[PDB]
Amino acid sequence: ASAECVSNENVEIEAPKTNIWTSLAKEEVQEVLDLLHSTYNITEVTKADFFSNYVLWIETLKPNKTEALTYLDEDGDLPPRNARTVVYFGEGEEGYFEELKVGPLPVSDETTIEPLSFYNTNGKSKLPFEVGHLDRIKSAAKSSFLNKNLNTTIMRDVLEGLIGVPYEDMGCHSAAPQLHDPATGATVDYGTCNINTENDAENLVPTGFFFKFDMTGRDVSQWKMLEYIYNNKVYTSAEELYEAMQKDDFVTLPKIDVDNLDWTVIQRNDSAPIRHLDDRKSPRLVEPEGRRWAYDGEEEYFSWMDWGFYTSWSRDTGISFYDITFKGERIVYELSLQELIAEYGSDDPFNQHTFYSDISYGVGNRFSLVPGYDCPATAGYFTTDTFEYDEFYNRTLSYCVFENQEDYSLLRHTGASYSAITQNPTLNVRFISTIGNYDYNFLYKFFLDGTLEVSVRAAGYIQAGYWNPETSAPYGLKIHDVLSGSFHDHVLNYKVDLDVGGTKNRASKYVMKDVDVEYPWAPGTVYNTKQIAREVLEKEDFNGINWPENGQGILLIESAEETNSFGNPRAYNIMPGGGGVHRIVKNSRSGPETQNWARSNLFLTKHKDEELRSSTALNTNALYDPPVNFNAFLDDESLDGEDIVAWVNLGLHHLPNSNDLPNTIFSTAHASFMLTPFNYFDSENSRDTTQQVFYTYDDETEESNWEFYGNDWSSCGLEVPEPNFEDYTYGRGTR
Amino acid sequence: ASAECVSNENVEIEAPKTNIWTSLAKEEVQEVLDLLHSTYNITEVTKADFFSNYVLWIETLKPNKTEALTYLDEDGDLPPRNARTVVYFGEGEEGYFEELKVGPLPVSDETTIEPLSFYNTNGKSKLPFEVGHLDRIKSAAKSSFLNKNLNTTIMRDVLEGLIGVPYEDMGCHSAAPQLHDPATGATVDYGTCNINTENDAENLVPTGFFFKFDMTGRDVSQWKMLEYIYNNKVYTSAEELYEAMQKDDFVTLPKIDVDNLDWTVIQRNDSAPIRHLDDRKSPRLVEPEGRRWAYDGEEEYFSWMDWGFYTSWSRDTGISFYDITFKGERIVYELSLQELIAEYGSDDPFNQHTFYSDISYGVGNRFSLVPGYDCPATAGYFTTDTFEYDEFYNRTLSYCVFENQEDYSLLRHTGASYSAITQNPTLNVRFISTIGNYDYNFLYKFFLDGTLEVSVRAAGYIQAGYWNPETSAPYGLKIHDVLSGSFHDHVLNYKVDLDVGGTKNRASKYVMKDVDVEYPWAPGTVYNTKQIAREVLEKEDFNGINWPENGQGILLIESAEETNSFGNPRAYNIMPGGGGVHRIVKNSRSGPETQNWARSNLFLTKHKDEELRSSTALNTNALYDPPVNFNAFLDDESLDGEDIVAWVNLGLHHLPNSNDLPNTIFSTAHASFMLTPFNYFDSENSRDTTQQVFYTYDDETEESNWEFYGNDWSSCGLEVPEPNFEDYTYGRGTR
Ligand SMILES: *[C@@H]1O[C@H](CO)[C@@H](O[C@@H]2O[C@H](CO)[C@@H](O)[C@H](O)[C@H]2NC(C)=O)[C@H](O)[C@H]1NC(C)=O
Ligand SMILES: *[C@@H]1O[C@H](CO)[C@@H](O[C@@H]2O[C@H](CO)[C@@H](O)[C@H](O)[C@H]2NC(C)=O)[C@H](O)[C@H]1NC(C)=O
Ligand SMILES: *[C@@H]1O[C@H](CO)[C@@H](O)[C@H](O)[C@H]1NC(C)=O
Ligand SMILES: *[C@@H]1O[C@H](CO)[C@@H](O)[C@H](O)[C@H]1NC(C)=O
Ligand SMILES: *[C@@H]1O[C@H](CO)[C@@H](O)[C@H](O)[C@H]1NC(C)=O
Ligand SMILES: *[C@@H]1O[C@H](CO)[C@@H](O)[C@H](O)[C@H]1NC(C)=O
Numbered sequence A, B: 001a002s003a004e005c006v007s008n009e010n011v012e013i014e015a016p017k018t019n020i021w022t023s024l025a026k027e028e029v030q031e032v033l034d035l036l037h038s039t040y041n042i043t044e045v046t047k048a049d050f051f052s053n054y055v056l057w058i059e060t061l062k063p064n065k066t067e068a069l070t071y072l073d074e075d076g077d078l079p080p081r082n083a084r085t086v087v088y089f090g091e092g093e094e095g096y097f098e099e100l101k102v103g104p105l106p107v108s109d110e111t112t113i114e115p116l117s118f119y120n121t122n123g124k125s126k127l128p129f130e131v132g133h134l135d136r137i138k139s140a141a142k143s144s145f146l147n148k149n150l151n152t153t154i155m156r157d158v159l160e161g162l163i164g165v166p167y168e169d170m171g172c173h174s175a176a177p178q179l180h181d182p183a184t185g186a187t188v189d190y191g192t193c194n195i196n197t198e199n200d201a202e203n204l205v206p207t208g209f210f211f212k213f214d215m216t217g218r219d220v221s222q223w224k225m226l227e228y229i230y231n232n233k234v235y236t237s238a239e240e241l242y243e244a245m246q247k248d249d250f251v252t253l254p255k256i257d258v259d260n261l262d263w264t265v266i267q268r269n270d271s272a273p274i275r276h277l278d279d280r281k282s283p284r285l286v287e288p289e290g291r292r293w294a295y296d297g298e299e300e301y302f303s304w305m306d307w308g309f310y311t312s313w314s315r316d317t318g319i320s321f322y323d324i325t326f327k328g329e330r331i332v333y334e335l336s337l338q339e340l341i342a343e344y345g346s347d348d349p350f351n352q353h354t355f356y357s358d359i360s361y362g363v364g365n366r367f368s369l370v371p372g373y374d375c376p377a378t379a380g381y382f383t384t385d386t387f388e389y390d391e392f393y394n395r396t397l398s399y400c401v402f403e404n405q406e407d408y409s410l411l412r413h414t415g416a417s418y419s420a421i422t423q424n425p426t427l428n429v430r431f432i433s434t435i436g437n438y439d440y441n442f443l444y445k446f447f448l449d450g451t452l453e454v455s456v457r458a459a460g461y462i463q464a465g466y467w468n469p470e471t472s473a474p475y476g477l478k479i480h481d482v483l484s485g486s487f488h489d490h491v492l493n494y495k496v497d498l499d500v501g502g503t504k505n506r507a508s509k510y511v512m513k514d515v516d517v518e519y520p521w522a523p524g525t526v527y528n529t530k531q532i533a534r535e536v537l538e539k540e541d542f543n544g545i546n547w548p549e550n551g552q553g554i555l556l557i558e559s560a561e562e563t564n565s566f567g568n569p570r571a572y573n574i575m576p577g578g579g580g581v582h583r584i585v586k587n588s589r590s591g592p593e594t595q596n597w598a599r600s601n602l603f604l605t606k607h608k609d610e611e612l613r614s615s616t617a618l619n620t621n622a623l624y625d626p627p628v629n630f631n632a633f634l635d636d637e638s639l640d641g642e643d644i645v646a647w648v649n650l651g652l653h654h655l656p657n658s659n660d661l662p663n664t665i666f667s668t669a670h671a672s673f674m675l676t677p678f679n680y681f682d683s684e685n686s687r688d689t690t691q692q693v694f695y696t697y698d699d700e701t702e703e704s705n706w707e708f709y710g711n712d713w714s715s716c717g718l719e720v721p722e723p724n725f726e727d728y729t730y731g732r733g734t735r
């Protein structure tokens, strides 16, 4: 019956400047790859080995900050357009990966190729083979080596006898990182076997069969199996284990029931009854009058309710944000996820040697978002791209942008014959990175007042461990017949380059404490009360900062000189949400210097172009001398009136239980922090939105009045649209 | 063009049992009131004074637990229907309020009236006048007394001279609680004046003029002003202050600019430009196939996706939940907010003496919800009632129930040529209590797997303080010309009577720690790793529990006897969210024994019917001997295999800044906790929902398949309905 709601089309805009942080165009990558091929003897990755040279990566080397700001704020020149490339060189006496700068682009006679190392605290462009990237070539070699050893007549018999299925029915693989010893030069690695499945559930059927091997050097004929480990006993050869197994006293631990694996299946059971009313569609968010954010498609610049920002995408980390402005002023120069680790504790030599660096695998080289489900149907989707091993990957549905209506209002008050309520619509930018078993859901949520919330939720299949009743209990709960929910930490680092009221800032904390005082108006009477005291964080602190006990503090990044009208420094408060935790372990043999940012909740440093990133894709196996040692940034420099960067961590101490099988859920695996204005303005700045109501009641007449500021709530008809399911296809990008 | 979405009607059901916790029917109240009138000499409140007898309150006295459970679970008899009443008796030599039980009901010859005290730990049914409730009669007496003193010729002159406006233009009022001294019997109180406004913004214009009076006893002619306090100086009489003001050296502090108060106005400034695209309506939640939760209107019993529960309403606290079940098993007998405090720290004698008990004022006797804004347009609304001072109040739109679509999925995984994603619809029960200046938004959010989240958000006008540059800085920021953002704690207590796998439970924690160990598979090699250790909380601990540093623990309520299939006790995890904070102050002269639950994050006690509630509406002024001293519950009783209650706190340390003017916002003033299954089942239990997708792709054919389990996402038309605005009228209930 009702008239149709008033439709409006999506709005596109022109960015104020070009996106100087954007990924390389296909043509730029091609020119660089061509130049690499004409400069060096380059072999195609599919034909390469440890003695070839081949190209791994080619991506944008982002501009330095000062040149970026000059361009953005002072009509300066476009910064130089350069590529970072990573090439493996095996032609020489020793193999190594080298980072090289190729630029400027487009390729011309001005273009040079030079060693690139300025952002590496270790000062090196070359990463030695022994601590090299676990790339396609090294992975294939390790796989071939494991097969060579595990598929002999003897080992086939040992594996089947212990595990209960033949070798064809399991998959053997290695722990990460590898373990290189700089003192002796040896490189060893542990591994395990899991039952093969058709539903990606291998991590739920680990067999408890382990091994250790020596993979030192580029000649694989010299690699050797060192140990087989089973039921906490060590065997130095296949033969020794085989013989042990023939003895009457040999103990074989309970085997996995591979005929009953329904408990690992995620999707719906066709025999399961529907809950009452679940035969009705769940609620849907709709936009009655169309989309309320705008964008420039060519420059990936976004605008929504006085916020602006550009996005950028990398293979290592996924999305990044640059030049985030609110009401025309920059609040954050760069906001960028840097690293995510997963560090296991266990009784067994596979999980106890697991300390993943997810950027080493790649966070930005995964799968598309599923419309309607991973993001609401009203989302818009964006394509990004990467380059790896000879192929340029186009990734559609890479990230999404949507306006939510939060289910609580932004503010309200009822009094004095009126009610004033302001709605809480938010802009949301999401991407989801499924890295093997885990699914990481990243969200950036912007609010009308100038507040931004950064969050992550995790789900997917856990990396469980075999349950041995004699030894597994201190490290996990028994969650299935022979399965432990191995204990681990997830920790993520974010580079938060706040520039509050300019680049020159101070960091301070309001410390809250109870104190005994006497007041002039009650002489002699002691009162126990509470006070605040502002403390300036004067210099970089090696210990970092941990959130105060009982929440007794507020952490601010202040403008050094700008104040509001009441004399307060303009500031933003870094407010922790859930997941304000850091690593429990302090001294890991699997990460001695490779992830040193993960030991406190947050760190504050002086901004430097050479301190670009807190980890690298090349860090994980370089245990003692990684390209970036985060601790090198902490060298007691003044932060008092300086360009400051906050490196903020979110984390989870995950101890999986029944509520993680078959999968972990996103609702209770959540971490977040907010950046909220604190004396940044003279008042709270959502007041100008039209998405609010002002209700008044007239005491004489007994007449109500409703002011909706141009929003007509009358019933109207709308089409609830089918999501773009057709745009989703399985896979990690189009090559 | 698209066909219309398939509509369905709201579903109503019959509760399995009657709501034995429900508020008294009007007829029940009438019968009790009539019986009180025939038993005692009762005066009508509008004609009463300190020497009259009059009725304050009449409400349901809820059943004891064992009798309730016999009725619910074993087809036992309905528990006795009883009223708790509170009557002021002034006819004697000393005045007191007395609690009286009237029952059973309906009124018959079986009905008696008896002193009621079993839930008061002090063992008394009588509250002495000096520590009495701040009721209509006492408020009136205090108001008259203040006018009699502040409106003399001399004080009119003093007030106008110091404040800059005449007496008619300000309002003077008293700090809460009052200050009764048991040793001498004296009762005193502080107070201040605020500028009158037309928009209920008095709290933003405190004058810095203070006073102190003695209000001991029932003869107001003996009450007397003790002090006037201004600029931190004390005057013992109006004359003394008047004389000082005439001297040349008298310092008058800066006055409020009463002609420029636009900064206190909440609603939109009509001259503000609209932000880009804010002339489009913000997004709306819609239900394409109708509502998916059901209820019994007569019994206030609710059903959604295998959850069931009953609600109850009280003047003191608002909503409570009883008999919360999931998949046919009770997990929580009673979930009830118990108290909310707001405790201020200040340099001044008004704010420093402010320690509000919100249940003393009433959390459940406030205003209706505003449709569409306070709750989404798809919400259903419920009417509740209370009785106070001769009047039965019917409160429509008292609470709302709605299904949200959260903007992130419940779980997902992509791998092995499939993607499986489960949506996250939640049931939400909300009420909002606006108590003078503050607006408290309470939300109860139920998830598909059996998790429940309890949260609060706060907004409204802060109780600010006059800014004296000489003394105010340790207690607040200067947020307007003569205004301080007075530091305060908000703390809320919730009674969480979990009964996990029966009433007989244990409480435990998994403690997480780093440890150095050696493993059998690598003799002599030390590893720094991490472990969990389960510790049973054997006995009640006076210190309560504070959440562990760096989050290194999981707190569980376990069934004492029931386990899942893998030997683990069935449990629920009490998971803190934001706002896991308790009072900073330890020893307040304004709450010595009245709020003893607020000093730690959580307490575990043995369930007792006599330990019904952790505070009472009668606690606030009874500083040393309140009806309930929570510490009485903590007497070292075993909890090892007992009915346990968790008293869980949520809080905020609020240091208002610019982002709180003109009002605090709900987005960043948030606290929550969750109750989540932990080995409660053998697996995660959302898997039977139909609100999920299973996408598969075949690598041979390149064909995709989408399984939506009966949910048709094809575009369809619906009407976006106008909220029931017509049901909203201003006011605190219909009398
Ligand atoms: C961005 O800044 C970095 C750090 O200042 C520059 O790094 C220098 O690079 C040159 C050659 O490229 C080296 O000789 C210097 O030793 C580097 N300095 C440091 C501190 O390591 C880098 O060149 C800058 N990038 C651009 C595009 O100008
Ligand atoms: C609910 O249980 C309480 C606690 O057992 C009962 O309180 C007893 O009440 C009687 C008289 O009412 C007193 O003699 C006892 O001393 C009380 N016991 C305690 C421990 O205080 C209360 O009566 C019960 N309520 C109902 C409706 O039966
Ligand atoms: C280029 O490298 C390949 C791979 O090792 C090698 O076979 C070949 O000898 C090299 N060719 C030249 C020009 O040296
Ligand atoms: C393993 O050995 C078996 C039997 O000897 C053989 O059939 C199979 O091809 C081998 N597998 C691999 C991957 O080499
Ligand atoms: C479906 O449910 C039935 C009944 O419990 C069970 O036997 C079977 O294992 C389930 N199948 C799957 C794939 O979960
Ligand atoms: C990548 O996808 C985008 C948008 O889906 C498209 O416009 C662009 O042409 C694609 N690039 C290539 C090289 O196919």
Ligand SMILES: *[C@@H]1O[C@H](CO)[C@@H](O)[C@H](O)[C@H]1NC(C)=O
Pocket (backbone or CB within 6 Å): B041, B042, B043, B051, B052, B053, B091
């Ligand atoms: C009834 O109470 C009123 C008010 O206190 C009082 O005036 C009157 O004396 C009372 N009647 C009796 C019999 O005490």
Ligand SMILES: *[C@@H]1O[C@H](CO)[C@@H](O)[C@H](O)[C@H]1NC(C)=O
Pocket (backbone or CB within 6 Å): B147, B151, B167
């Ligand atoms: C205060 O006194 C003034 C003048 O003496 C009078 O006009 C006014 O009504 C009084 N206010 C009250 C509340 O009695």
Ligand SMILES: *[C@@H]1O[C@H](CO)[C@@H](O)[C@H](O)[C@H]1NC(C)=O
Pocket (backbone or CB within 6 Å): B262, B263, B265, B269, B270, B271, B272
């Ligand atoms: C409305 O905006 C104008 C222009 O900035 C300002 O002068 C005035 O104070 C505002 N009024 C209110 C009620 O906020």
Ligand SMILES: *[C@@H]1O[C@H](CO)[C@@H](O)[C@H](O)[C@H]1NC(C)=O
Pocket (backbone or CB within 6 Å): B026, B383, B394, B395, B396
């Ligand atoms: C209270 O309000 C409800 C719903 O509006 C109504 O059904 C009921 O009759 C009212 N009760 C009284 C006593 O008016």
Ligand SMILES: [Ca+2]
Pocket (backbone or CB within 6 Å): A333, A497, A498, A499, A500, A503, A505, A607, A643, A644, A645
């Ligand atoms: Ca900065």
Ligand SMILES: [Ca+2]
Pocket (backbone or CB within 6 Å): A540, A605, A606, A632, A633, A634, A635, A636, A637
């Ligand atoms: Ca430094």
Ligand SMILES: [Ca+2]
Pocket (backbone or CB within 6 Å): B333, B497, B498, B499, B500, B503, B607, B643, B644, B645
């Ligand atoms: Ca219990």
Ligand SMILES: [Ca+2]
Pocket (backbone or CB within 6 Å): B540, B605, B606, B632, B633, B634, B635, B636, B637
């Ligand atoms: Ca006890």
Ligand SMILES: [Cu+2]
Pocket (backbone or CB within 6 Å): A458, A462, A488, A490, A654
């Ligand atoms: Cu995990």
Ligand SMILES: [Cu+2]
Pocket (backbone or CB within 6 Å): B458, B462, B488, B490, B654
């Ligand atoms: Cu507050």
